What we know:
Layout: H1 5-17, H2 23-26, H3 35-38, H4 43-46, H5 53-61, H6 68-85, H7 91-108
Amino acid sequence: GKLSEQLKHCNGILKELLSKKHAAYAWPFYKPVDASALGAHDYHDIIKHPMDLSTVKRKMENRDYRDAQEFAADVRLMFSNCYKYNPPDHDVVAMARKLQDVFEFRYAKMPD
């Protein structure tokens, strides 16, 4: 029930990533990628392990993370799938990078 101090820190990061301050570049990450809606041909063949913020949020709220490294692994997977699928000049890759900079910096500030 009670998050560890490290996971509480991670829950703060999640709240920040979902906050209106970042909404102009965070929105593609709010729900699972809808490959048909985006015309992302073969998305689910190339990306074997989809991830997004609603899934990280559900895992956090259900107290399913066992440690902070698992949280970071999911958030990094979300960004990596984006980079993996898309070309470097795609608008979504720029948005991913802006959001990942928020993540990586705040994650680094996690209490030992």
